PDB file of C-alpha atoms in Angstrom:
ATOM      1  CA  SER A  11    -146.756  71.313 -17.185  1.00  0.00           C
ATOM      2  CA  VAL A  12    -148.393  74.513 -18.289  1.00  0.00           C
ATOM      3  CA  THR A  13    -148.893  75.457 -21.940  1.00  0.00           C
ATOM      4  CA  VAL A  14    -149.006  79.185 -22.710  1.00  0.00           C
ATOM      5  CA  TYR A  15    -150.122  80.514 -26.091  1.00  0.00           C
ATOM      6  CA  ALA A  16    -149.048  84.133 -26.499  1.00  0.00           C
ATOM      7  CA  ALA A  17    -149.218  86.848 -29.143  1.00  0.00           C
ATOM      8  CA  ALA A  18    -145.941  87.067 -31.073  1.00  0.00           C
ATOM      9  CA  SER A  19    -145.204  90.514 -29.628  1.00  0.00           C
ATOM     10  CA  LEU A  20    -144.835  88.807 -26.228  1.00  0.00           C
ATOM     11  CA  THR A  21    -142.117  86.376 -27.391  1.00  0.00           C
ATOM     12  CA  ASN A  22    -139.182  87.866 -25.497  1.00  0.00           C
ATOM     13  CA  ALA A  23    -141.029  88.795 -22.310  1.00  0.00           C
ATOM     14  CA  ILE A  24    -142.738  85.417 -21.956  1.00  0.00           C
ATOM     15  CA  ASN A  25    -139.533  83.530 -22.767  1.00  0.00           C
ATOM     16  CA  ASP A  26    -137.835  85.433 -19.937  1.00  0.00           C
ATOM     17  CA  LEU A  27    -140.699  84.706 -17.541  1.00  0.00           C
ATOM     18  CA  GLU A  28    -140.786  81.022 -18.541  1.00  0.00           C
ATOM     19  CA  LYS A  29    -137.117  80.687 -17.562  1.00  0.00           C
ATOM     20  CA  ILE A  30    -137.691  82.477 -14.239  1.00  0.00           C
ATOM     21  CA  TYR A  31    -140.724  80.329 -13.391  1.00  0.00           C
ATOM     22  CA  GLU A  32    -138.880  77.113 -14.256  1.00  0.00           C
ATOM     23  CA  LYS A  33    -136.058  78.037 -11.881  1.00  0.00           C
ATOM     24  CA  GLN A  34    -138.607  78.745  -9.109  1.00  0.00           C
ATOM     25  CA  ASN A  35    -140.899  75.731  -9.598  1.00  0.00           C
ATOM     26  CA  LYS A  36    -140.758  72.059 -10.553  1.00  0.00           C
ATOM     27  CA  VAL A  37    -143.127  72.829 -13.460  1.00  0.00           C
ATOM     28  CA  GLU A  38    -142.423  72.703 -17.195  1.00  0.00           C
ATOM     29  CA  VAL A  39    -143.692  75.764 -19.082  1.00  0.00           C
ATOM     30  CA  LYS A  40    -144.488  75.172 -22.768  1.00  0.00           C
ATOM     31  CA  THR A  41    -144.822  78.242 -24.995  1.00  0.00           C
ATOM     32  CA  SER A  42    -146.264  78.856 -28.451  1.00  0.00           C
ATOM     33  CA  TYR A  43    -146.130  82.226 -30.218  1.00  0.00           C
ATOM     34  CA  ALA A  44    -148.094  83.296 -33.302  1.00  0.00           C
ATOM     35  CA  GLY A  45    -150.632  85.904 -34.261  1.00  0.00           C
ATOM     36  CA  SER A  46    -153.396  86.174 -31.690  1.00  0.00           C
ATOM     37  CA  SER A  47    -155.918  85.118 -34.373  1.00  0.00           C
ATOM     38  CA  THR A  48    -154.054  81.900 -35.207  1.00  0.00           C
ATOM     39  CA  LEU A  49    -153.694  81.018 -31.530  1.00  0.00           C
ATOM     40  CA  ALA A  50    -157.346  81.625 -30.656  1.00  0.00           C
ATOM     41  CA  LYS A  51    -158.555  79.565 -33.608  1.00  0.00           C
ATOM     42  CA  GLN A  52    -156.217  76.735 -32.610  1.00  0.00           C
ATOM     43  CA  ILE A  53    -157.581  76.774 -29.044  1.00  0.00           C
ATOM     44  CA  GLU A  54    -161.097  76.717 -30.490  1.00  0.00           C
ATOM     45  CA  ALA A  55    -160.133  73.591 -32.462  1.00  0.00           C
ATOM     46  CA  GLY A  56    -158.967  71.865 -29.277  1.00  0.00           C
ATOM     47  CA  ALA A  57    -155.316  72.857 -28.851  1.00  0.00           C
ATOM     48  CA  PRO A  58    -154.359  72.200 -25.191  1.00  0.00           C
ATOM     49  CA  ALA A  59    -153.356  75.711 -24.148  1.00  0.00           C
ATOM     50  CA  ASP A  60    -153.804  76.354 -20.425  1.00  0.00           C
ATOM     51  CA  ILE A  61    -153.281  80.117 -20.772  1.00  0.00           C
ATOM     52  CA  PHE A  62    -153.780  82.515 -23.693  1.00  0.00           C
ATOM     53  CA  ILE A  63    -152.459  86.067 -23.945  1.00  0.00           C
ATOM     54  CA  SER A  64    -153.960  88.050 -26.824  1.00  0.00           C
ATOM     55  CA  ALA A  65    -152.734  91.336 -28.302  1.00  0.00           C
ATOM     56  CA  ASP A  66    -156.339  92.560 -28.429  1.00  0.00           C
ATOM     57  CA  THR A  67    -159.650  92.273 -26.611  1.00  0.00           C
ATOM     58  CA  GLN A  68    -161.387  90.891 -29.710  1.00  0.00           C
ATOM     59  CA  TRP A  69    -159.621  87.534 -29.861  1.00  0.00           C
ATOM     60  CA  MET A  70    -160.201  86.894 -26.143  1.00  0.00           C
ATOM     61  CA  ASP A  71    -163.872  87.847 -26.637  1.00  0.00           C
ATOM     62  CA  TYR A  72    -163.875  85.354 -29.521  1.00  0.00           C
ATOM     63  CA  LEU A  73    -162.990  82.568 -27.077  1.00  0.00           C
ATOM     64  CA  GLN A  74    -165.318  83.872 -24.350  1.00  0.00           C
ATOM     65  CA  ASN A  75    -168.265  83.819 -26.745  1.00  0.00           C
ATOM     66  CA  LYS A  76    -167.478  80.132 -27.397  1.00  0.00           C
ATOM     67  CA  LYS A  77    -167.383  79.470 -23.617  1.00  0.00           C
ATOM     68  CA  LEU A  78    -163.656  78.640 -23.709  1.00  0.00           C
ATOM     69  CA  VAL A  79    -162.780  81.315 -21.127  1.00  0.00           C
ATOM     70  CA  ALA A  80    -164.981  82.726 -18.367  1.00  0.00           C
ATOM     71  CA  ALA A  81    -165.400  86.464 -17.792  1.00  0.00           C
ATOM     72  CA  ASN A  82    -163.908  86.063 -14.318  1.00  0.00           C
ATOM     73  CA  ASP A  83    -160.877  84.124 -15.640  1.00  0.00           C
ATOM     74  CA  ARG A  84    -159.422  86.949 -17.753  1.00  0.00           C
ATOM     75  CA  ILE A  85    -157.729  90.235 -16.865  1.00  0.00           C
ATOM     76  CA  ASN A  86    -156.377  93.118 -18.932  1.00  0.00           C
ATOM     77  CA  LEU A  87    -152.634  92.789 -18.340  1.00  0.00           C
ATOM     78  CA  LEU A  88    -150.525  94.995 -20.640  1.00  0.00           C
ATOM     79  CA  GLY A  89    -150.638  98.027 -22.892  1.00  0.00           C
ATOM     80  CA  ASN A  90    -148.529  99.036 -25.887  1.00  0.00           C
ATOM     81  CA  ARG A  91    -148.247 101.752 -28.546  1.00  0.00           C
ATOM     82  CA  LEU A  92    -148.333 101.490 -32.351  1.00  0.00           C
ATOM     83  CA  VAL A  93    -145.290 102.720 -34.318  1.00  0.00           C
ATOM     84  CA  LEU A  94    -143.914 103.090 -37.819  1.00  0.00           C
ATOM     85  CA  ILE A  95    -140.507 101.525 -38.397  1.00  0.00           C
ATOM     86  CA  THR A  96    -137.864 101.646 -41.106  1.00  0.00           C
ATOM     87  CA  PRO A  97    -134.720  99.589 -41.631  1.00  0.00           C
ATOM     88  CA  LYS A  98    -131.695 100.971 -39.847  1.00  0.00           C
ATOM     89  CA  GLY A  99    -129.889 103.173 -42.314  1.00  0.00           C
ATOM     90  CA  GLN A 100    -133.070 104.326 -44.104  1.00  0.00           C
ATOM     91  CA  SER A 101    -134.417 106.542 -41.317  1.00  0.00           C
ATOM     92  CA  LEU A 102    -137.517 108.705 -41.703  1.00  0.00           C
ATOM     93  CA  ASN A 103    -139.685 110.906 -39.528  1.00  0.00           C
ATOM     94  CA  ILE A 104    -143.359 110.850 -40.512  1.00  0.00           C
ATOM     95  CA  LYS A 105    -146.169 112.617 -38.654  1.00  0.00           C
ATOM     96  CA  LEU A 106    -149.201 110.368 -38.208  1.00  0.00           C
ATOM     97  CA  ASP A 107    -151.644 113.191 -38.870  1.00  0.00           C
ATOM     98  CA  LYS A 108    -154.446 113.768 -41.383  1.00  0.00           C
ATOM     99  CA  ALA A 109    -152.382 116.559 -42.995  1.00  0.00           C
ATOM    100  CA  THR A 110    -149.683 114.100 -44.076  1.00  0.00           C
ATOM    101  CA  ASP A 111    -150.005 112.636 -47.574  1.00  0.00           C
ATOM    102  CA  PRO A 112    -149.272 108.877 -47.458  1.00  0.00           C
ATOM    103  CA  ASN A 113    -148.498 108.962 -51.175  1.00  0.00           C
ATOM    104  CA  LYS A 114    -145.671 111.436 -50.516  1.00  0.00           C
ATOM    105  CA  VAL A 115    -144.105 109.769 -47.448  1.00  0.00           C
ATOM    106  CA  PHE A 116    -144.663 106.053 -48.244  1.00  0.00           C
ATOM    107  CA  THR A 117    -142.875 105.486 -51.552  1.00  0.00           C
ATOM    108  CA  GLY A 118    -142.508 101.701 -51.246  1.00  0.00           C
ATOM    109  CA  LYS A 119    -144.373  98.960 -49.424  1.00  0.00           C
ATOM    110  CA  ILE A 120    -145.794  99.042 -45.896  1.00  0.00           C
ATOM    111  CA  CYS A 121    -145.462  95.769 -43.985  1.00  0.00           C
ATOM    112  CA  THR A 122    -147.779  94.871 -41.101  1.00  0.00           C
ATOM    113  CA  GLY A 123    -150.089  92.120 -39.868  1.00  0.00           C
ATOM    114  CA  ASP A 124    -153.141  91.154 -41.911  1.00  0.00           C
ATOM    115  CA  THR A 125    -155.516  94.056 -41.359  1.00  0.00           C
ATOM    116  CA  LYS A 126    -158.578  91.827 -40.967  1.00  0.00           C
ATOM    117  CA  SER A 127    -157.300  89.372 -38.412  1.00  0.00           C
ATOM    118  CA  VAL A 128    -153.914  90.060 -36.810  1.00  0.00           C
ATOM    119  CA  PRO A 129    -154.193  92.539 -33.892  1.00  0.00           C
ATOM    120  CA  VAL A 130    -151.342  94.802 -35.052  1.00  0.00           C
ATOM    121  CA  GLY A 131    -152.932  95.085 -38.485  1.00  0.00           C
ATOM    122  CA  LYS A 132    -156.402  95.685 -37.075  1.00  0.00           C
ATOM    123  CA  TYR A 133    -155.049  98.523 -34.955  1.00  0.00           C
ATOM    124  CA  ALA A 134    -153.193  99.846 -37.981  1.00  0.00           C
ATOM    125  CA  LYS A 135    -156.325  99.805 -40.113  1.00  0.00           C
ATOM    126  CA  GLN A 136    -158.273 101.678 -37.412  1.00  0.00           C
ATOM    127  CA  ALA A 137    -155.566 104.345 -37.500  1.00  0.00           C
ATOM    128  CA  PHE A 138    -155.500 104.585 -41.298  1.00  0.00           C
ATOM    129  CA  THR A 139    -159.272 104.977 -41.369  1.00  0.00           C
ATOM    130  CA  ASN A 140    -159.180 107.592 -38.606  1.00  0.00           C
ATOM    131  CA  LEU A 141    -156.497 109.521 -40.507  1.00  0.00           C
ATOM    132  CA  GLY A 142    -158.301 109.374 -43.862  1.00  0.00           C
ATOM    133  CA  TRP A 143    -155.426 107.345 -45.323  1.00  0.00           C
ATOM    134  CA  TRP A 144    -156.971 103.920 -45.949  1.00  0.00           C
ATOM    135  CA  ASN A 145    -157.552 103.975 -49.696  1.00  0.00           C
ATOM    136  CA  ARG A 146    -154.043 105.365 -50.307  1.00  0.00           C
ATOM    137  CA  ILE A 147    -152.398 102.965 -47.816  1.00  0.00           C
ATOM    138  CA  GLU A 148    -154.081  99.713 -48.846  1.00  0.00           C
ATOM    139  CA  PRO A 149    -152.386  99.378 -52.281  1.00  0.00           C
ATOM    140  CA  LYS A 150    -148.974  99.488 -50.556  1.00  0.00           C
ATOM    141  CA  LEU A 151    -149.523  96.741 -47.976  1.00  0.00           C
ATOM    142  CA  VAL A 152    -147.556  93.553 -47.455  1.00  0.00           C
ATOM    143  CA  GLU A 153    -149.464  91.609 -44.816  1.00  0.00           C
ATOM    144  CA  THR A 154    -148.090  88.983 -42.437  1.00  0.00           C
ATOM    145  CA  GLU A 155    -149.621  86.542 -39.977  1.00  0.00           C
ATOM    146  CA  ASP A 156    -147.947  88.037 -36.907  1.00  0.00           C
ATOM    147  CA  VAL A 157    -146.166  91.239 -35.962  1.00  0.00           C
ATOM    148  CA  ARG A 158    -142.733  89.595 -35.717  1.00  0.00           C
ATOM    149  CA  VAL A 159    -142.846  88.369 -39.320  1.00  0.00           C
ATOM    150  CA  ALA A 160    -143.441  91.988 -40.326  1.00  0.00           C
ATOM    151  CA  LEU A 161    -140.663  93.212 -38.030  1.00  0.00           C
ATOM    152  CA  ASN A 162    -138.237  90.834 -39.745  1.00  0.00           C
ATOM    153  CA  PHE A 163    -139.236  91.878 -43.274  1.00  0.00           C
ATOM    154  CA  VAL A 164    -138.294  95.436 -42.313  1.00  0.00           C
ATOM    155  CA  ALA A 165    -135.175  94.362 -40.420  1.00  0.00           C
ATOM    156  CA  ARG A 166    -133.948  92.540 -43.539  1.00  0.00           C
ATOM    157  CA  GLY A 167    -134.663  95.605 -45.688  1.00  0.00           C
ATOM    158  CA  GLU A 168    -137.339  93.796 -47.684  1.00  0.00           C
ATOM    159  CA  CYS A 169    -139.961  96.516 -47.031  1.00  0.00           C
ATOM    160  CA  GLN A 170    -139.364 100.281 -46.751  1.00  0.00           C
ATOM    161  CA  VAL A 171    -141.731 100.752 -43.805  1.00  0.00           C
ATOM    162  CA  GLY A 172    -143.461  98.563 -41.266  1.00  0.00           C
ATOM    163  CA  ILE A 173    -146.119  99.015 -38.630  1.00  0.00           C
ATOM    164  CA  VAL A 174    -145.351  97.207 -35.383  1.00  0.00           C
ATOM    165  CA  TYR A 175    -145.698  97.811 -31.654  1.00  0.00           C
ATOM    166  CA  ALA A 176    -143.318 100.105 -29.773  1.00  0.00           C
ATOM    167  CA  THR A 177    -141.980  97.028 -27.966  1.00  0.00           C
ATOM    168  CA  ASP A 178    -141.132  95.360 -31.293  1.00  0.00           C
ATOM    169  CA  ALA A 179    -139.146  98.386 -32.439  1.00  0.00           C
ATOM    170  CA  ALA A 180    -137.261  98.302 -29.134  1.00  0.00           C
ATOM    171  CA  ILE A 181    -136.242  94.637 -29.476  1.00  0.00           C
ATOM    172  CA  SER A 182    -134.646  94.972 -32.942  1.00  0.00           C
ATOM    173  CA  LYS A 183    -131.334  96.760 -33.405  1.00  0.00           C
ATOM    174  CA  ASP A 184    -132.070  96.546 -37.138  1.00  0.00           C
ATOM    175  CA  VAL A 185    -135.081  98.905 -37.272  1.00  0.00           C
ATOM    176  CA  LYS A 186    -135.741 102.474 -36.124  1.00  0.00           C
ATOM    177  CA  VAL A 187    -138.969 104.247 -35.191  1.00  0.00           C
ATOM    178  CA  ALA A 188    -140.222 106.594 -37.909  1.00  0.00           C
ATOM    179  CA  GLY A 189    -143.295 107.806 -36.028  1.00  0.00           C
ATOM    180  CA  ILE A 190    -145.642 107.006 -33.136  1.00  0.00           C
ATOM    181  CA  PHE A 191    -149.372 106.800 -33.784  1.00  0.00           C
ATOM    182  CA  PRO A 192    -151.327 109.081 -31.419  1.00  0.00           C
ATOM    183  CA  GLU A 193    -153.517 107.124 -29.033  1.00  0.00           C
ATOM    184  CA  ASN A 194    -156.632 108.797 -30.413  1.00  0.00           C
ATOM    185  CA  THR A 195    -156.172 107.174 -33.854  1.00  0.00           C
ATOM    186  CA  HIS A 196    -157.078 103.646 -32.706  1.00  0.00           C
ATOM    187  CA  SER A 197    -158.569 101.567 -29.915  1.00  0.00           C
ATOM    188  CA  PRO A 198    -156.205 101.154 -26.948  1.00  0.00           C
ATOM    189  CA  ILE A 199    -153.715  98.341 -27.398  1.00  0.00           C
ATOM    190  CA  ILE A 200    -154.675  95.962 -24.571  1.00  0.00           C
ATOM    191  CA  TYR A 201    -153.382  92.446 -23.887  1.00  0.00           C
ATOM    192  CA  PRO A 202    -155.954  90.311 -22.043  1.00  0.00           C
ATOM    193  CA  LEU A 203    -154.606  87.327 -20.117  1.00  0.00           C
ATOM    194  CA  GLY A 204    -156.943  84.342 -20.002  1.00  0.00           C
ATOM    195  CA  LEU A 205    -156.976  81.174 -17.902  1.00  0.00           C
ATOM    196  CA  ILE A 206    -158.276  78.562 -20.350  1.00  0.00           C
ATOM    197  CA  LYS A 207    -157.717  75.353 -18.357  1.00  0.00           C
ATOM    198  CA  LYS A 208    -158.430  75.730 -14.637  1.00  0.00           C
ATOM    199  CA  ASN A 209    -155.942  73.605 -12.705  1.00  0.00           C
ATOM    200  CA  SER A 210    -153.529  74.229  -9.849  1.00  0.00           C
ATOM    201  CA  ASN A 211    -150.451  74.696 -12.066  1.00  0.00           C
ATOM    202  CA  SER A 212    -152.170  76.961 -14.591  1.00  0.00           C
ATOM    203  CA  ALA A 213    -153.785  79.145 -11.903  1.00  0.00           C
ATOM    204  CA  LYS A 214    -150.364  79.567 -10.272  1.00  0.00           C
ATOM    205  CA  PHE A 215    -148.743  80.673 -13.543  1.00  0.00           C
ATOM    206  CA  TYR A 216    -151.698  82.973 -14.273  1.00  0.00           C
ATOM    207  CA  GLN A 217    -151.102  84.697 -10.918  1.00  0.00           C
ATOM    208  CA  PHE A 218    -147.330  84.749 -11.513  1.00  0.00           C
ATOM    209  CA  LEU A 219    -147.822  86.760 -14.725  1.00  0.00           C
ATOM    210  CA  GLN A 220    -149.532  89.429 -12.580  1.00  0.00           C
ATOM    211  CA  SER A 221    -146.839  89.396  -9.899  1.00  0.00           C
ATOM    212  CA  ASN A 222    -144.407  92.140  -8.933  1.00  0.00           C
ATOM    213  CA  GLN A 223    -141.674  89.952 -10.438  1.00  0.00           C
ATOM    214  CA  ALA A 224    -143.432  89.734 -13.830  1.00  0.00           C
ATOM    215  CA  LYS A 225    -144.119  93.491 -13.886  1.00  0.00           C
ATOM    216  CA  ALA A 226    -140.363  94.136 -13.896  1.00  0.00           C
ATOM    217  CA  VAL A 227    -139.850  91.945 -16.968  1.00  0.00           C
ATOM    218  CA  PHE A 228    -142.730  93.443 -18.944  1.00  0.00           C
ATOM    219  CA  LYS A 229    -141.632  96.990 -18.131  1.00  0.00           C
ATOM    220  CA  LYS A 230    -138.058  96.151 -19.191  1.00  0.00           C
ATOM    221  CA  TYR A 231    -139.372  95.289 -22.654  1.00  0.00           C
ATOM    222  CA  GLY A 232    -141.411  98.495 -22.864  1.00  0.00           C
ATOM    223  CA  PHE A 233    -144.909  97.230 -22.118  1.00  0.00           C
ATOM    224  CA  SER A 234    -147.143  99.203 -19.809  1.00  0.00           C
ATOM    225  CA  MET A 235    -148.894  97.503 -16.886  1.00  0.00           C
ATOM    226  CA  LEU A 236    -152.632  98.109 -16.925  1.00  0.00           C
ATOM    227  CA  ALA A 237    -154.445  99.243 -13.782  1.00  0.00           C
TER     228      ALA A 237
END
């Protein structure tokens, strides 16, 4: 068997690829989804993940610095974009630009990942700082431990606005995009793929995730394939 720990934004894509791989191989694929921070810390504490897919470079670097992944056993796999979402039926259009006043357009809470640790929240905080919004945004935050928890708060109408990835907005019929953050407001959203345990089965699944067959699944969900 192969155990794959993956950022919560990858839940649907990796579940699809797990099913495909299991049909094509006599191998059991075990999956665990959470915030990239939680997953990396668990691996550090000895969790038996063979493969880790982070929603940012930082949490893979975190493991590399602790010698848990080698520089030659990781590759930048996927890209994404950062978006504002609202519940269906409370649509907005907000320009993510310095000229916009967050106190005028955000009149409730803003739900996203913890801005210190969860990739989606770290990207969001970079963007708020770049836009000059941080000290007006921070008092409105409801912070979660992965991007899908935040997506569901907005889908249930429990928060007026959320910040999630473009792929998360696409998966939920219950939320709509209220604005796309320009790429120049934050570091590029990059998903590194890391081979943590080097064995025959794990190396095969690591290559499979880079295959022409996997590219079709990721693109279907709205991820970009990195060069």
